[PDB]
Structure 1
Amino acid sequence: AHAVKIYDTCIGCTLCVRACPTDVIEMVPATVNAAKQVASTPRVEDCVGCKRCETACPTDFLSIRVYLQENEETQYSLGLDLADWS
């Protein structure tokens, strides 16, 4: 499961949420940005690692970071379509 993290620099764009093809990122209330909302990743197990969320983050560097973990691949992380491991 590719770990995905959210940092203080997030400004509540919701672009990372809209860019996720597997509904990993999620908008929680917070008191750190003017938008009063901050991205969170409660469904990292569905993260394929495509880094579309990083392509849509407007901050100077990625307020959302996807750390690929090749030693912990999952059928959800590998995007398996014809093989089931459950």
Structure 2
Amino acid sequence: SHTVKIYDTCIGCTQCVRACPTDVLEMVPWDGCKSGQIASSPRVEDCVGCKRCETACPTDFLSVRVYLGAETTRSLGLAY
């Protein structure tokens, strides 16, 4: 459904993965930052488009960007 992309400016603060309401983001090993960790979006099929993740990023400009797109039952948050 929606598209979430992570950029090299990430600092591995883990704040984004701790804010997702649907477990779409994970922290994976990396060497480009001091923390030695980067964020990934393995399960974008469950993204609802809340953008809470973006609100949590501390980088000058979001290192995590959510681009809204095709809509499915899951993305539209339909319990019915």
Q: TM-score, normalised by structure 1?
A: 0.92
Q: Determine the structure 1 residue equivalent to 2:33.
A: 33
The one of 61, 66, 72 equivalent to 1:74 is: 72
Structure 1 unaligned spans of 5+: none
In 1, the alpha carbon distance for the partners of 2:9 and 2:37 equals 12
Percent of pairs identical after alignment? 75
When you count helix as a share of all residues, which structure comes out higher? 1
In our comparison, the structure showing a higher alpha carbon Rg is 1
The runs of 4+ residues in structure 1 deviating greater than 4 Å are: none
One-letter amino acid of the structure 2 residue matched with residue 68 of structure 1 = L
Q: 5+ residue gaps in structure 2?
A: none
Opposite residue 21 of structure 1, the aligned amino acid is P
Alpha-carbon shift at residue 39 of structure 1 (Å): 0.3
Shift of 1:31: 0.6
Deviations 1:31-69 (A, max 9, x none): 100000000000000000000000000000000000011
Q: Residue 27 of structure 1: SS of its match in structure 2?
A: strand
SS at match of 1:39: strand
Separation in 1, partners of 2:33, 2:74: 32
SS of equivalent to 2:65: strand
What is the aligned residue count? 80
TM-superposed CA distance for 1:6, in Å, is 0.4
